[PDB]
């Protein structure tokens, strides 16, 4: 009744190592989930030993943004028509800025281009306590109880202690921490139509009892926005998979912060409209051939996702061209 798939596990570990070596990185992790039941199909770590997917806390960076955008849509604090001013700004001395100046974006653009500014403005429409409860409901700070030793709850600071700038940076993934397994888990709220899943190391005959975070319509709209990340104009085109539409988010978190020391993340699901698989890839401190999540973690995501769909017998939803 173990949920692991050895063929997916082998594929994930082989592609993970190829990427870690090619980019001359220190380490990497991969999680592959059943997008419908939360069954864990593969967990891969390199270099060997410690189960970093389970034990290692990371700041998720921009990989948290889909949930902030989803929450803002779900509560009616924005909609798919609003064009937000996304010029850089400061809260006191601390800047909030994107990799480019975008004068304005709608929420599709905020997702597609990965705007820290736009996401922080959406989050700022909620009180600190509301955002704190929301992050907790996503499971940040809540142990997975995977059964592995060395597992931590993650980090979610008490909202009463938050500075306004800290609520802002949390909304684009700094100042809170979770493991790649917890982050991959959060994505089941988007794939499983607004219902967060527990995840399991056992095969699930039916999707288990979960917990609603978003309306079903919100999740479906947000999955559609995330397809823009793998299409031209998005930050994650390296993750597009032949024959499928892929909903994804890229992340490029600085470590501590540092100039040129990063954690590159790529997380996505497919078929985007009716997801079957979530693949999450993190590459720790690439030093060659790029450092952003799309360029670094996209290519292994593409290979692991495409191979996982084929292994599982999922038919392409559009004609193959490659
Ligand atoms: Cl806990
Ligand atoms: Cl689809």
Numbering used by the authors: 236 to 282, 296 to 504, 509 to 574
In the authors' words:
In order to provide a direct correlation of the dynamics observed by NMR with affinity for ceftriaxone separate from acylation, and elucidate whether pH changes and the H514A mutant have a consequence on the PBP2–ceftriaxone interaction, we introduced a catalytically inactive S310A mutant of tPBP2WT (tPBP2WT–S310A, hereafter referred to as tPBP2∗). To understand how pH affects the structure of tPBP2, we determined the crystal structures of tPBP2∗ at pH 7.5 and 9.5 and of tPBP2∗–H514A at pH 7.5. All structures were obtained in the same P21 crystal system, with two molecules present in each asymmetric unit, as previously reported for the WT enzyme. In the structure of tPBP2∗ determined at pH 7.5, the β3–β4 loop exhibits disorder in both molecules of the asymmetric unit but to different degrees. In molecule B, residues 501 to 514, a region spanning the β3–β4 loop, lack electron density, indicating disorder. Although the electron density is relatively weak, more residues could be modeled in molecule A, and it can be seen clearly that the loop adopts the inward and twisted conformation observed previously in PBP2 acylated by ESCs. The only density visible corresponds to the inward and twisted conformation, showing that the β3–β4 loop can occupy this conformation in the absence of ligands in the active site. Importantly, close crystal packing interactions around the loop in molecule A appear to preclude it from occupying the extended conformation, whereas the environment around the loop in molecule B is more open and allows it to occupy different conformations. Consistent with a conformational equilibrium of states, the loop in molecule B is disordered at pH 7.5, but upon binding ceftriaxone, it transitions to the inward and twisted conformation as observed previously in acylated crystal structures of PBP2 (17).
PBP2 is an essential peptidoglycan transpeptidase (TPase) that crosslinks the peptide chains from adjacent peptidoglycan strands during cell-wall synthesis. β-lactam antibiotics, including the extended-spectrum cephalosporin (ESC) ceftriaxone, are analogs of the d-Ala-d-Ala C terminus of the peptidoglycan substrate and as such target PBP2 by binding to and reacting with the active-site serine nucleophile (Ser310 in N. gonorrhoeae PBP2) to form a covalently acylated complex. PBP2 is comprised of an N-terminal membrane anchor, a putative pedestal domain, and a C-terminal catalytic TPase/β-lactam–binding domain. The TPase domain of PBP2 contains a central five-stranded antiparallel β-sheet surrounded by α-helices on both sides. The serine nucleophile, Ser310, located at the N-terminal end of the α2 helix, is spatially adjacent to the β3 strand of the central β-sheet. β3 contains the conserved Lys497Thr498Gly499 (KTG) motif that twists during β-lactam antibiotic binding to form the oxyanion hole for acylation.
